[PDB]
């Protein structure tokens, strides 16, 4: 659940 260091909220 991480895309280019952006994690799910």
């Amino acid at each position, epitope marked *: 659940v991480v*895309n280019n260091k952006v994690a799910t909220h």
Partner: antibody, heavy 123, light 108 residues
Framework: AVQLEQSGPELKKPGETVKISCKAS????????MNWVKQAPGKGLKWMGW????????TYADDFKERFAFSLETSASAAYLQINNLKNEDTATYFC????????????????WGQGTTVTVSS | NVLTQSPAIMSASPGEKVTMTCRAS???????LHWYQQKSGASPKLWIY???NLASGVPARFSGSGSGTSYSLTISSVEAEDAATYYC?????????FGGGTKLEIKR
């Protein structure tokens, strides 16, 4: 149907505790952060912080690092705001507001808002 | 990152073009500068997101622009229903902050 349905108005005494719920529907609860916003009577919007609904991790804004607790019951798609040791200044309307997302990334805006919960602190 | 909105209160006759400003103390990415509309006590509504993007159902008479530390919301021809308070909001790292609001009153 995306809805954030909040609990009814509360009256509490100073020093008591209040817990407000925000029941989410129409979307995967755990994929969007839940934000909390305070609006004192006749004043502006103030962001209290947010809770990560996937991990349960709460983040508090600098003025709400004391007596404030965000929590979840993910099975119920519900988010909670607890305020401890209530003060008169906690008299306000509290909104829960969902994270706005693009196709992948957060916009760091709030798209869906609850109807708000008025808290009155008084003896 | 403090948002300052002006004017605090503004008045416009229907059909007039109006612009209200939001200035930040430090840079905000155009991606992360938003506007909400709120009518007396009811829940705020997301109005403009990422500077210039109108939320669903927002009329095309609204627009937003700006960059860095200077942003604005414009209404090309004001309507009665636009009577509201409009708040800008930013993220540039936490916390989110909101401006103090611009209250738009309609002249008749």
């Amino acid at each position: 149907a995306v809805q954030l349905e909040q609990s009814g108005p509360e009256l509490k005494k100073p020093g008591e505790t209040v817990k407000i719920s925000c029941k989410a529907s129409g979307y995967t609860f755990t994929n969007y952060g839940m934000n909390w916003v305070k609006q004192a009577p006749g004043k502006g919007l103030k962001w209290m912080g947010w809770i990560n609904t996937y991990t349960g991790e709460p983040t508090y804004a600098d003025d709400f690092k004391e007596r404030f607790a965000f929590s979840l019951e993910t099975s119920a798609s519900a988010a909670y705001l607890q305020i401890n040791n209530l003060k008169n200044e906690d008299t306000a309307t509290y909104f829960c507001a969902r994270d706005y997302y693009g196709s992948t990334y957060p916009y760091y805006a709030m798209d869906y808002w609850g109807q708000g919960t008025t808290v009155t602190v008084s003896s | 990152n403090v948002l300052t909105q002006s004017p605090a209160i503004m008045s416009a006759s229907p059909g007039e073009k109006v612009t209200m400003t939001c200035r930040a103390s430090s840079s905000v990415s155009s991606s992360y500068l938003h506007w909400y509309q709120q009518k007396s006590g009811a829940s705020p509504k997301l109005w403009i997101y990422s500077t210039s993007n109108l939320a669903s159902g927002v009329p095309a008479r609204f627009s937003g622009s700006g960059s860095g530390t200077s942003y604005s919301l414009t209404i090309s021809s004001v309507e009665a229903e636009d009577a509201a308070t409009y708040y800008c909001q930013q993220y540039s790292g936490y916390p989110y902050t909101f401006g103090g609001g611009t209250k738009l009153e309609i002249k008749r």
